[PDB]
């Protein structure tokens, strides 16, 4: 991936996460938790949805026969027709191959990006009360119970409240 998250420092994903695409898994006083982030998940999903609808496509362009399967047309005209058809088949076989490859590359790099968008955003909330482990975790240098964890998940956590305590743990 391009954003270095998925298949990057986050060494792998959680098969236990049947809840959504992205999510937080914490370990604190009460124990361990694992819930999904609807917000970032829906953004990725809405984007992949957008591709599907724009690609699933009806061309209101009607094409009729120029060949004949029951009574073969003149050989010369029959060959120009076949020659043309094959040439266009080449173009569409090419376009289709590229289109899908192009989109897939983008689909992946889009998801990788959506993760990195979440990580870099949490880091902005905590400011000074925590430090990066490396493999996608925030080591908190202050006591954070389950209701402290939920304050981050619904984007309400205040860094000022635990600033002095956490900064003290230098």
């Amino acid at each position: 991936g391009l954003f270095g998250a998925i298949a990057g420092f986050i060494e792998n994903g959680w098969e236990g996460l049947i809840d959504g695409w992205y999510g937080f898994r914490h370990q604190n006083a009460q124990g361990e938790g694992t819930a999904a982030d609807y917000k970032s998940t829906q953004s990725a999903i809405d984007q992949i949805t957008g591709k599907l609808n724009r690609l699933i496509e009806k061309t209101n362009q009607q094409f009729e026969l120029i060949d004949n399967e029951f009574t073969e047309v003149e050989k010369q005209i029959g060959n120009v027709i076949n020659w043309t058809r094959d040439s266009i088949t080449e173009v569409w076989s090419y376009n289709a191959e590229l289109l899908v490859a192009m989109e897939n590359q983008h689909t992946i790099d889009l998801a990788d990006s959506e993760m990195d968008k979440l990580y870099e955003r949490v880091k902005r909330q905590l400011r000074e009360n925590a430090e990066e482990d490396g493999t996608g975790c925030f080591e908190i240098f202050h006591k954070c119970d389950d209701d402290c964890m939920a304050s981050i998940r619904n984007n309400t956590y205040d860094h000022s409240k635990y600033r002095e305590e956490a900064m003290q743990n230098r």
Binding site: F24, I56, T89, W92, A101
Partner: protein, 316 residues
């Protein structure tokens, strides 16, 4: 002590291809190339005409098999392999061009041209075009001399398209199994047919001689055709070996023509047809028949092209 975050995964995800890699496994993918088929002609909601043993061109001239199709009307026209354009052996000059015209004609409306004849025979028949025994093409007149070897008086007939749309005009030329039987009808001596108009300008001469016994005959009929404009006028200068057009043909509207050998079905709706049935799909591509007609997905060489709809799959 800490809070971790990540993404989902699966024990078994699907392999796709990217700009930079083949067989990269992702979470969820989907098919992009249609291969699934419906072995019927999905004609729900369409005025359909299954020609069966009637050839498309036959609906203009009128051999026995096409008696129920002389004035058909359709949105969808199906040709069958067993269909025949002819009873008495013969062919159409520029047949495919005419077939292509009729396929998107939306059906046909016939109209008498109004030809009367001074002292010749008309009720010419054959054991090939049989109804109550020997008969002929419903829309055609077999012009002869009164009886054997009698002179064929150089006649001249004419029709004017009095309608806003172009008229499909069709005449025939008789080619006899020998110069002997040729005279038995029209007499000896060179016979000549000339046809003209604004657009059109040409002429025709018979060519008697022995051919293989097709359908029980050694003779052949050459059907020809032109497209007469509004107000324009057709003229037939002739003296034998001629098959007169009784009625002129007029196109109804719009339609589509296909060729198939599968059964018609009014339960399902379709827009993309081919000889083995109907392609119903929303997928942009298809790997079934390159010669499919209608509103179709683009035909491609690949049997499959998977589109990633999930993220990269990194398992545990």
């Amino acid at each position: 002590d800490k809070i971790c975050l990540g993404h989902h995964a699966v024990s078994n995800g699907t392999k796709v291809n990217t700009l930079t890699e083949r067989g990269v496994e992702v979470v969820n993918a989907t098919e992009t190339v249609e291969r699934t088929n419906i072995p019927r002609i999905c004609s729900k909601g369409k005025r359909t005409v299954d020609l069966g043993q009637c050839g498309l061109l036959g609906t203009i001239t009128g051999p026995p098999q096409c008696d129920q199709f002389l004035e058909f009307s359709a949105d969808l026209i199906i040709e069958r392999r067993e269909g025949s354009d002819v009873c008495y052996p013969g062919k159409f000059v520029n047949e495919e061009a005419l077939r292509q015209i009729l396929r998107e004609s939306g059906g046909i409306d016939k109209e008498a041209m109004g030809f009367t004849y001074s002292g010749i025979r008309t009720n010419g028949a054959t054991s090939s075009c049989r109804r109550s025994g020997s008969s002929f093409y419903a829309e055609m007149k077999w012009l002869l001399s009164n009886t054997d070897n009698a002179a064929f008086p150089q006649m001249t007939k004419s029709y004017k398209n009095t309608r806003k749309n172009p008229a499909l005009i069709v005449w025939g030329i008789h080619h006899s199994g020998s110069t002997a039987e040729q005279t038995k009808l029209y007499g000896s001596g060179n016979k000549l047919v000339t046809v003209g108009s604004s657009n059109y300008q040409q002429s025709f001469v018979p060519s008697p001689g022995a051919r293989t016994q097709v359908n029980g005959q050694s003779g052949r009929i050459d059907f020809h055709w032109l497209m007469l404009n509004p107000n324009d006028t057709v003229t037939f200068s002739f003296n034998g070996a001629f098959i007169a057009p009784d009625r002129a043909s007029f196109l109804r509207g719009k339609s589509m023509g296909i060729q198939s050998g599968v059964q018609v079905d009014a339960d399902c709706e379709g827009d993309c047809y081919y000889s083995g049935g109907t392609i119903i799909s929303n997928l942009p591509f298809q790997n079934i028949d390159s010669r499919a007609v209608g509103k179709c997905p683009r035909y491609v060489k690949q049997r499959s092209l998977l589109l990633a709809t999930g993220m990269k799959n990194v398992p545990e």
